[PDB]
């Protein structure tokens with residue numbers, strides 16, 4: 001039995017070996033308790049305000065929209081401590097771990113941002129943090145690895161399988177199945193087995209709550225659409241959650257198109273993968289015809305989780321949210337555009353969301369539309385990537 | 394077919410436990426895997442547990458992860474696994490054959506079609522490693538519709554509700570992880586228990602049976618002999634033969 005529904009329509013669930021079920025059940029009980037505890041809420045809100053810097057700004061982009069009938073705002077998760085939205089939910093999950101009397105955190109990371117977010121939350125709250133990272137990733141994300149180690153986390157390179165994110169996920173879970181009495185597994189997106197899609201949404205929902213308050217204050221109405229990139233689904237579901245019941249507000253999720261959907265080299269499982277069961281959940285994923293799990297490809301490594309959160313698959317199926325893709329080249333153009341016209345360097349992840357909004361504006365410049373893009377992170381980390389591409393051109 | 398029921402009845406008559414090797418199909422290649430399996434049987438394996446190579450074998454340790462990698466290096470696919478299974482059953486009509494599967498391979502071309510394929514090639518049971526009993530309904534129903542026993546892990550800390558579910562839903566045998574659980578399972582009329590995980594010596598086989606389990610499963614110990622002897626397939630088979638013979642002897646009355 002569970003306290004909460006582990007499924008969103010046919011998607012989600014708890015597809016883990018039997019030995020991990022007590023860990024998930026314990027976590028669900030702790031979360032349900034925490035959500036009813038005003039003291040927990042107050043402590044979380046306090047860290048978000050006074051450590052992470054919430055609320056984040058909502059910035060209008062007149063320079064980009066000039067001469068069209070689009071009004072565009074960026075929700076500034078790039079201004080959160082750590083430079084990306086991932087900080088919100090790691091602080092909530094670190095508090096949950098403390099609530100459960102856990103003194104140790106396990107996390108996975110691919111492009112290193114969840115690793116850094118987990119390490120900073122663990123440093124603040126005095127937890128012993130160990131991070132699993134595919135050896136290939138350890139090699140290509142040395143700045144992030146160095147950050148994790150500065151913050152006192154142990155970074156464990158994963159050699160098994162293909163030595164990437166999914167192998168790091170597997171090592172984290174194997175460890176947790178043995179250590180869950182004393183360690184919490186701080187999963188890095190709104191995916192994996194229940195209760196993680198639910199917990200991560202709830203600990204990111206202030207993105208959309210704030211956006212709603214700020215847009216009402218500045219424009220006196222709700223947005224026509226909110227737009228967010230979708231790697232695993234956390235920043236998008238955090239922006240979307242408070243608007244789900246506002247049926248006039250469009251919810252647009254942007255998966256990475258990589259070199260183009262037709263090339264096969266993309267990271268868009270929701271719209272171009274096939275439902276499977278892996279990562280503890282039933283969800284669309286990148287997989288071979290005979291059911292071996294594959295990789296997502298994007299210029300942005302942070303969008304490379306090869307499946308997607310089950311609530312996104314559900315919101316798509318019922319037509320409440322629409323999902324699209326943006327290619328590497330479109331993301332690069334949006335990155336350049338924001339730097340030049342607003343003086344903001346966006347994460348290449350977030351640049352996928354911005355690119356779609358720019359398309360919405362440019363394709364129909366006399367359409368009245370009030371848009372919010374979730375600017376999930378800053379793009380300092382991407383300047384070498386962008387430099388190298390632009391130089392080879 | 395009731396191959397597990399028949400085996401356990403026969404073993405019971407002989408006051409004997411089952412010894413059940415675990416190997417990965419197609420490790421280290423198709424032809425050598427078939428030989429390995431024939432060797433395990435000819436050395437006295439009572440039943441088999443066989444893994445289908447999967448990209449992300451979460452619930453397996455390094456030895457078996459490596460076995461999967463070896464099989465993939467040989468280009469082994471689930472389709473090839475099913476061809477091997479048919480050939481194995483064709484050679485060996487009575488030995489119970491159980492698969493250790495991950496959910497995606499079962500769900501991939503449709504859960505019903507997967508179990509129908511198991512029935513066609515003469516498999517007896519399927520343990521889906523990453524389907525907990527709480528979410529097993531479509532799997533165990535499809536299994537039973539196709540005369541396949543669904544196998545469930547019973548963890549050493551299992552609570553009473555979990556014991557009751559495992560006893561009700563499982564068939565063939567209960568997979569018990571390494572005397573109280575054994576007695577509760579018997580109380581709740583569960584399928585006979587096989588003890589698995591870290592069984593690597595005759596003494597542990599004997600201990601499992603003495604505790605009241607119907608037998609013991611060994612995988613890492615067996616696959617290590619494969620890994621050890623990759624360069625010498627002939628010696629590989631001799632060493633497998635002597636190890637299985639010793640382990641089987643330890644189950645005898």
Ligand SMILES: O=C(NCCOP(=O)(O)O)c1ccc(OC(F)(F)F)cc1
Pocket residue numbers: 108109110111112113114115165169170173187188189191192193232278279280301302305
């Ligand atoms: O996408 C995931 N992690 C995000 C890592 O973020 P980053 O450091 O930016 O790669 C992620 C991790 C685990 C997972 O489920 C399960 F645990 F079952 F494997 C699903 C998704």
Ligand SMILES: O=C(NCCOP(=O)(O)O)c1ccc(OC(F)(F)F)cc1
Pocket residue numbers: 016017019020173174175177415451452453454455456457458590612613
């Ligand atoms: O089976 C396990 N251990 C070793 C036995 O397998 P193998 O050594 O491959 O025969 C094993 C280890 C961890 C586990 O939990 C989870 F996968 F979720 F992390 C489940 C099973």
Ligand SMILES: O=C(NCCOP(=O)(O)O)c1ccc(OC(F)(F)F)cc1
Pocket residue numbers: 017018415442452453493520521522523546589590591592610611612613614
């Ligand atoms: O039978 C298995 N392994 C062989 C016996 O263990 P060992 O001798 O230690 O390799 C075996 C059974 C189940 C399993 O996954 C899960 F537990 F989740 F269901 C993994 C390995």
Ligand SMILES: *Cc1c(COP(=O)(O)O)cnc(C)c1O
Pocket residue numbers: 083084085086113114188189190229230231232233234235236302303347349350376377378
């Ligand atoms: C990790 C990351 C993402 C992608 O993860 P989601 O869970 O899909 O939000 C997006 N933007 C930034 C800046 C990230 O660091």
Ligand SMILES: [Cl-]
Pocket residue numbers: none
């Ligand atoms: Cl508020």
Ligand SMILES: [Cl-]
Pocket residue numbers: none
């Ligand atoms: Cl309000």
Ligand SMILES: [Cl-]
Pocket residue numbers: 217218219220
């Ligand atoms: Cl106003």
Ligand SMILES: [Cl-]
Pocket residue numbers: none
């Ligand atoms: Cl200018």
Ligand SMILES: [Cl-]
Pocket residue numbers: 557558561
């Ligand atoms: Cl029952």
Ligand code: NA
Pocket residue numbers: 230231232267269296303304305306307308
């Ligand atoms: Na994805």
